């Protein structure tokens, strides 16, 4: 009769009926992904909507149960997950507008396009029309309009929609005990648990700034060298001590700096390690990559891929006329139906990606024993972190020697480590400030702390002060810039891409140490070290049953996140960055703009 009894049984009809409706929408999603046709689209939606309708019916039934009255915290992790409502709390009049607003923004982002001012006939989409320009251009003019055309058309059309997206999402957030929309979105990290293993919504804001304070000396040194090399690419178009413009950052928004490597390569003469050519000469087509990756994960003491994985999964692009989506994905379909869909050619990147995606499957297999609600990453940033560390270990020249992709005697030159480390900083640290401004900008916008006219004038104000990114053209109140990003314009949290990279090197540092790696942390290879695999699997197998505070401590040995392990990873680069920045400025002035000159 007690709510404790009435909620366990309620999570034995949900769990039993969830696996069927999730699997039917997983097979259907796979069949649409592995065979794009109108017949499969209707099957996917019909089976997908049944689970969505069932979940919403079950979730509202969960809210009748008072969350406070429970005692066992295992089901509280489940009931709290089920009590989550989102737009459901809003009235039918408001929710239909909100779901329209979400659909309108997603359709405006996806089906919207920007046009060349030189060529009005060509109006390229973002993917792949505008991704190609932003990630593979070197001209000031070509990048400028393509950077702003995507924000003067898509962004401004979302400006009125975001204001009601701010307003309505605050109301549903305020319809529960969440003070604003941001507080609702930082409840992924909020934890009620035993003392010391509990986390607060307020604590996240302090901790993100806490790590970011330590990152800035690393970032600004990296910011300065990237700027110093960039100024050669764009002479007289940027200031030597000025903050970085936004249309030369390797992509549209500035999320990653990885596409600046060709123009910011530390040692251009030394080539980057590539085992593609030898792999074709050893006749690896597509099967060896996943069999060898199976051996690599087996070396660290992780289980090998199941029998069903090999047949059911799509491991090559079909020869016959069957259109498929080539984006790699580690499909956890439920009922131990782990699959990988990947158009893998004979290349090292697919070789590394096959280790990446299979890292998701190793995580998926690990927590598959957890209940249906709890079979996920410890927080939103835990599942991607685990996959990433596998790619770091697989790409080490130490590992490639073991599997025969390198000559028995090869030059492990120190110049090719700065090239590897610097290409690993254009991604890891190129996103840490950007992934912090967004939540900082939004949690104030959701709180209203940024003026409506200065929404895009406290955008650069926040950008220059905390990110080093400056406007290349003046922005009025109309041009909604943050809503020109996929996650913001599709109502997705972006802080998960900050804790992930912070946890990525807390895992790696705590796995190379147990592996007894001697030397720098970048050339660490945990291959053949079963000790490292046993340590990670303990964090993997618990899934989401325990707070991310407890899960992180089990592997890293630290209660909360910290960027000290990530500072060690780039320490060989940092000592090389500091010794290269002696002739260059450090820190960014927040009072410069290129259009003024």
């Amino acid at each position: 009769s007690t709510t404790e009894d009435l909620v366990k049984t309620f999570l034995e009809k949900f769990n039993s009926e969830a696996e069927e409706l999730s699997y039917q929408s997983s097979l259907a999603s796979w069949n649409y992904n592995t065979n794009i046709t109108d017949e499969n689209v209707q099957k996917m939606n019909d089976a997908g909507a049944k689970w969505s309708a069932f979940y919403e019916e079950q979730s509202k039934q969960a809210k009748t149960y008072p969350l406070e009255e429970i005692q066992d915290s295992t089901v509280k992790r489940q009931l709290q997950a089920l009590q989550h409502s989102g737009s459901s709390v809003l009235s039918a009049d408001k929710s239909q507008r909100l779901n329209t607003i979400l659909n309108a923004m997603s359709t405006i982002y996806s089906t919207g396009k920007a046009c060349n001012p030189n060529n009005p006939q060509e109006c390229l989409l973002l993917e792949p029309g505008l991704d190609d320009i932003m990630a593979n251009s070197r001209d000031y003019n070509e990048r400028l309009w393509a950077w702003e055309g995507w924000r003067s058309e898509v962004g401004k059309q979302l400006r009125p929609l975001y204001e009601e997206y701010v307003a309505l999402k605050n109301e549903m957030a305020r319809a529960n005990n969440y003070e604003d929309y941001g507080d609702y979105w930082r409840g992924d990290y909020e934890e009620e648990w035993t003392n010391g293993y509990n986390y607060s919504r307020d604590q996240l804001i302090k901790d993100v700034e806490q790590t970011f304070t330590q990152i800035q000396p690393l970032y600004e040194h990296l910011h300065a060298y990237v700027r110093a090399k960039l100024m050669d690419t764009y002479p007289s178009h940027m200031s030597p001590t000025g903050c970085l413009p936004a249309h030369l950052l390797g992509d549209m928004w500035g999320r990653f700096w990885t596409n600046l490597y060709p123009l910011t390569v530390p040692f251009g003469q030394k080539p980057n390690i590539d085992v593609t050519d030898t792999m074709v000469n050893q006749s690896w087509d597509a099967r060896r990559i996943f069999e060898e990756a199976e051996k690599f994960f087996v070396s660290v003491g992780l289980p090998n891929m199941t029998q069903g994985f090999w047949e059911n999964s799509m491991l090559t692009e079909p020869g016959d006329s069957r259109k498929v989506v080539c984006h790699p994905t580690a499909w956890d379909l439920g009922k131990h139906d782990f699959r990988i869909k990947m158009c893998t050619k004979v290349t090292m990147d697919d070789f590394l990606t096959a280790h990446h995606e299979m890292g998701h499957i190793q995580y998926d297999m690990a927590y598959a024993a957890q209940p249906f609600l709890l079979r996920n990453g410890a927080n939103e940033g835990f599942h991607e972190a685990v996959g990433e560390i596998m790619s770091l270990s697989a790409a080490t020249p130490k590992h490639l020697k073991n599997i025969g992709l390198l000559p028995p005697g090869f030059s492990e030159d120190n110049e090719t480590d700065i090239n590897f480390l610097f290409k690993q900083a254009l991604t890891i640290v190129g996103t840490l400030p950007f992934t912090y401004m967004l939540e900082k900008w939004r949690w104030m916008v959701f709180k209203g702390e940024i003026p409506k006219e200065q929404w895009m004038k406290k955008w650069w104000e926040m950008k220059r002060d905390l990110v080093g990114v400056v406007e290349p053209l003046p922005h009025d109140e109309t041009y909604c810039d943050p809503a020109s990003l996929f996650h913001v314009a599709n109502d997705y949290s972006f802080i998960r891409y900050y804790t992930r990279t912070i946890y990525q090197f807390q895992f790696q540092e705590a796995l190379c140490q147990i592996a007894k790696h001697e030397g720098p942390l970048h050339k660490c290879d945990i291959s053949n070290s079963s000790e490292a695999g046993q340590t990670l699997l303990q964090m993997l197998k618990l899934g989401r049953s325990k707070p991310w505070t407890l899960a992180l401590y089990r592997v890293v040995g630290a209660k909360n996140m910290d960027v000290r392990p990530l500072l060690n990873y780039f320490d060989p680069l940092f000592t090389w960055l500091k010794e290269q920045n002696r002739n260059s400025f450090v820190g960014w002035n927040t009072d410069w703009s290129p259009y003024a000159d």
């Binding site: 009769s1 009894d5 009435l6 366990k8 049984t9 309620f10 034995e12 009809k13 039993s16 009926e17 696996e19 069927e20 699997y23 039917q24 097979l27 039934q61 009748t64 199941t306 029998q307 069903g308 994985f309 059911n312 009922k335 131990h336 139906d337 782990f338």
Partner: protein, 190 residues
């Protein structure tokens, strides 16, 4: 008197865990040569009796019970083991003597579009005793108050497996025969 003991077990239709059927094939001698073959079986196992010397031992009164648990639930079919299937369905007694057999009927008992024919009690009031079968589909309420769905806290006890041929090894159907070998002649009392 020569009687096959796998010919019947090669039936196209197999009982589910809820409706397991006690096929008493007794008073006849059969060739255990199939029992030795483990290429076709996947859970050749025994409890309290010799597996290789089962042919030698003639003190057997078989109480073969057939049912279809899935791949992850075959380990649930063990004396002293409990789980979703082992406490609301045919429970193996702690002192059960005999052998437990299984094989992966993924081709036969699973369909690429989903096979939901087989049943098992997800919810029950009390504990199902070993060797006890209950035939009832009354709706279950956690408090125990009779009601009619879709009224809140009133669910259906029986649930069905989402059997597929594409699922992982642990989510494929496994036919299970529980041969309860026993000595018929016992001098319990004068």
């Amino acid at each position: 008197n020569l009687c096959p003991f796998g010919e019947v077990f090669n039936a196209t239709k197999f009982p589910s865990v809820y409706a397991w059927e006690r096929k008493k094939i007794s008073n006849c001698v059969a060739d255990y040569s199939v029992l030795y073959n483990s290429t076709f079986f996947s859970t050749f196992k025994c409890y309290g009796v010799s597996a290789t010397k089962l042919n030698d031992l003639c003190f057997s009164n078989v109480y073969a019970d057939s049912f279809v648990v899935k791949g992850d639930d075959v380990r649930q079919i063990a004396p002293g083991q409990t789980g979703v299937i082992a406490d609301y369905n045919y429970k193996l007694p702690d002192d059960f003597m005999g052998c437990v057999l299984a094989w992966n009927t993924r081709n036969i008992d699973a369909t690429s579009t989903g096979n939901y024919n087989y049943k098992y009690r997800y919810l029950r009031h009390g504990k199902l005793r070993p060797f006890e079968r209950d035939i009832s589909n009354v709706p279950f309420s956690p408090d125990g108050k009779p009601c009619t769905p879709p009224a809140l806290n009133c669910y259906w006890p029986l649930n069905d497996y989402g059997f597929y041929t594409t699922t992982g090894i642990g989510y494929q159907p496994y036919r299970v025969v529980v041969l309860s070998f026993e000595g018929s002649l016992e001098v319990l009392f004068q």
